[PDB]
Amino acid sequence: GRMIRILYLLVKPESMSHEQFRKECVVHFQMSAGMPGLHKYEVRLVAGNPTDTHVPYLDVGRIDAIGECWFASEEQYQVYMESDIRKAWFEHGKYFIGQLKPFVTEELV
Amino acid sequence: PQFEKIEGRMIRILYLLVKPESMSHEQFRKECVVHFQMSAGMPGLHKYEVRLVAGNPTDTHVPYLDVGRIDAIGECWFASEEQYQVYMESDIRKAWFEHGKYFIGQLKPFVTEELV
Amino acid sequence: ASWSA
């Protein structure tokens, strides 16, 4: 309700194979357990890229995984940003994410 | 709980939405809400969510990926292959897609897959 | 993969 959500498009580093990247997504998820201020974390692979849409198709290049963070409140978000383990977690992100696009979302219903 | 774990493992399709060039942001928000309302009881569909893009932070610790302006993000969950086919065969779905044609200018789908 | 409170 006060819930903040940030969705991320993840592209793997060019120095990594797809399998190496998959394994580091698992490591990133395991690392996230009990993260201060975080309500939920999800990371999933992009398995398919359908192009037979009924409205014009939007090409955004090759996205390898999708990540998403939930925070139950603004207060939880600030606890997360000031956490030392969150900063170490972001360092691991630098290792296995070549490029990323964040979206802060808003609920409509 | 158990429920959220199995739900997370469903067939899921995530969508990047761009509004039509000519449509106002105000109208686009209203049509997103209509589209969610139309999803109620959609045959074969377990869950639908639609959200606006409210922020585009660019101060990332990872190199930033520019994908242009995305206005909303949609997501569908289907509990099984059989339910996905019920949906694909449904006339009620075809009417929903007609509404999509009105308020969505451009669309990128991703079919996702679970890890652990 | 996900977890939540």
Side-chain angles (χ1 to χ4, degrees):
Chain A
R2 350 134 69 101
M3 195 81 74
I4 293 159
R5 296 166 67 181
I6 313 176
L7 188 122
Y8 300 92
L9 310 181
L10 276 65
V11 183
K12 77 175 171 53
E14 276 292 307
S15 63
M16 213 164 267
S17 65
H18 179 88
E19 173 59 23
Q20 288 178 322
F21 175 73
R22 191 196 62 77
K23 291 186 164 94
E24 295 301 322
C25 285
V26 178
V27 171
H28 212 239
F29 176 76
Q30 289 167 344
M31 286 172 171
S32 78
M35 182 64 57
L38 192 55
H39 173 73
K40 177 180 173 175
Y41 186 57
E42 186 163 45
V43 59
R44 50 181 32 241
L45 302 172
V46 176
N49 289 272
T51 61
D52 40 355
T53 44
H54 297 271
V55 300
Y57 168 84
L58 173 72
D59 199 345
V60 299
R62 197 200 72 250
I63 306 300
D64 298 312
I66 302 299
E68 189 167 1
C69 293
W70 285 250
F71 313 86
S73 68
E74 288 177 59
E75 287 84 0
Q76 295 311 119
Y77 184 77
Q78 290 306 323
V79 169
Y80 172 83
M81 281 318 278
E82 305 286 344
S83 163
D84 287 336
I85 195 78
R86 193 275 308 161
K87 290 171 187 198
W89 191 48
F90 275 34
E91 287 301 302
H92 173 75
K94 294 166 149 166
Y95 173 71
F96 88 105
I97 307 168
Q99 300 165 91
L100 66 63
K101 167 65 190 184
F103 303 108
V104 179
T105 59
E106 176 179 344
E107 302 298 330
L108 284 166
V109 294
Chain B
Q2 249 201 61
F3 203 85
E4 228 188 289
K5 175 162 80 197
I6 304 305
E7 189 177 59
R9 287 199 296 108
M10 287 187 175
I11 299 166
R12 291 166 66 182
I13 314 178
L14 177 77
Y15 300 91
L16 309 185
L17 284 63
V18 182
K19 79 169 178 66
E21 183 68 7
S22 80
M23 181 173 283
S24 63
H25 285 285
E26 188 191 302
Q27 190 191 354
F28 179 71
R29 182 194 180 105
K30 289 193 181 66
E31 301 305 324
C32 289
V33 174
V34 165
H35 209 65
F36 178 83
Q37 290 171 329
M38 287 179 78
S39 79
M42 181 58 60
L45 183 65
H46 171 68
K47 180 181 180 185
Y48 185 59
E49 175 169 58
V50 61
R51 299 172 275 169
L52 289 175
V53 176
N56 289 270
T58 67
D59 50 356
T60 53
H61 299 84
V62 170
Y64 174 77
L65 181 76
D66 189 0
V67 298
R69 196 195 76 253
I70 303 303
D71 301 304
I73 304 167
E75 191 172 356
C76 291
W77 286 245
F78 311 90
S80 70
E81 293 184 52
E82 293 89 347
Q83 292 288 119
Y84 181 75
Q85 296 304 147
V86 168
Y87 167 82
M88 292 293 305
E89 286 169 0
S90 176
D91 282 333
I92 296 181
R93 179 198 59 71
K94 303 192 163 154
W96 198 38
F97 286 30
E98 291 306 308
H99 180 255
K101 282 173 177 180
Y102 177 57
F103 85 106
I104 310 166
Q106 306 167 258
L107 187 68
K108 168 64 183 180
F110 303 108
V111 177
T112 57
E113 71 176 334
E114 55 261 49
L115 33 125
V116 168
Chain C
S2 77
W3 61 259
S4 57

